[PDB]
């Protein structure tokens, strides 16, 4: 439980995190379906309890860069990823900052508002400075 | 002139509570972008003339040859579903622009 | 003024957790990037608007 896994349940092959649901299914049901008609929960066939299925956490990787005509130093955004999941992969950290946009790595958070330069999103921007 | 102004702004508040159609342009934009993502997700359930929509139903019972025939319909259909969504979203982006 | 920015893993949408579907998708080459460049082009503009 609470781990990303390749599951199979009575022949329902798939991949994701498994979790203990609060959803009650009536006795004849075995899969849970979301509005999209996509699967979102399953019953355990041995200890008849309902389990939520959630995606293994994933996102775009964006590299924030000054010009190569300026530097080799770069920062990386893992979009909509919670910082606690990037240690799995720069996972040394030393400079890590978590935002509404995801986890930003290799950039120094500074309280001073400057004018926007490279747009990160969710009110955040980045730039190259002393 | 001020009392008319003050009364008129009161009527804006009262009106915006009252009418559901007021913000209709904005809601119709949300509804279209949402409808297109739910449409794009529901296309994953389509068979495209394959024996199943579920990728491992095809792989688990077949060899490299018969799987390539079957999976290549799903790749065709799903790529055609993205090229559809992105065409709609590009066209819809020009309306928003 | 704007709409929701949307970005898609063309590989995860077509082929989620299958190397086989990935290798068959390579037969079509750059189309997944062409789509992602377009959705990025939309998404960037939403800030501009």
């Amino acid at each position: 439980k609470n781990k990303c896994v390749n599951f199979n349940f009575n022949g329902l092959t798939g991949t994701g995190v498994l979790t203990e649901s609060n959803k009650k299914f009536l006795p004849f049901q075995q899969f849970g379906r979301d509005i999209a008609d996509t699967t979102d929960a399953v019953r355990d066939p041995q200890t008849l309890e309902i389990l939520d299925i959630t995606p293994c956490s994933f996102g775009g990787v964006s590299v924030i860069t000054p010009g190569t005509n300026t530097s080799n130093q770069v920062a990386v955004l893992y979009q909509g990823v919670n910082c606690t999941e990037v240690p799995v992969a720069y996972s040394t950290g030393s400079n890590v900052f978590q935002t509404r946009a995801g986890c930003l790595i290799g950039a120094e958070y500074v309280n001073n508002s400057y004018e926007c330069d490279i747009p990160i999103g969710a009110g955040i921007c980045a730039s190259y400075q002393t | 002139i001020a009392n008319q102004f003050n009364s008129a702004i009161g009527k804006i508040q009262d009106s915006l509570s009252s009418t559901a159609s007021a913000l209709g342009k904005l809601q119709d934009v949300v509804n279209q972008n949402a409808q297109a993502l739910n449409t794009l997700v529901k296309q994953l359930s389509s068979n495209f003339g394959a024996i199943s929509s579920v990728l491992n139903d095809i792989l688990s019972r077949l060899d490299k040859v018969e799987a390539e025939v079957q999976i290549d319909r799903l790749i065709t259909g799903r790529l055609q579903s993205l090229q559809t969504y992105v065409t709609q979203q590009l066209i819809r982006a020009a309306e928003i622009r | 003024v704007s709409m929701t920015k949307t970005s898609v893993d063309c590989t995860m949408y077509i082929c989620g957790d299958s190397t086989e579907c990935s290798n068959l998708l390579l037969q079509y080459g750059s189309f997944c990037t062409q789509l992602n460049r377009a959705l990025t082009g939309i998404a960037v503009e939403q800030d501009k608007n």
Binding site: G60 | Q27 | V8, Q46, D47
Partner: peptide, 25 residues
């Protein structure tokens, strides 16, 4: 106004937060 993850579809945040838009307004 009254307002997918596991299929690779992701909703990116706007650059201006609804606070920054309240500021410019």
């Amino acid at each position: 106004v009254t307002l997918q993850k596991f299929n690779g579809l992701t909703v990116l945040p706007p650059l201006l937060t609804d606070e920054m838009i309240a500021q410019y307004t």
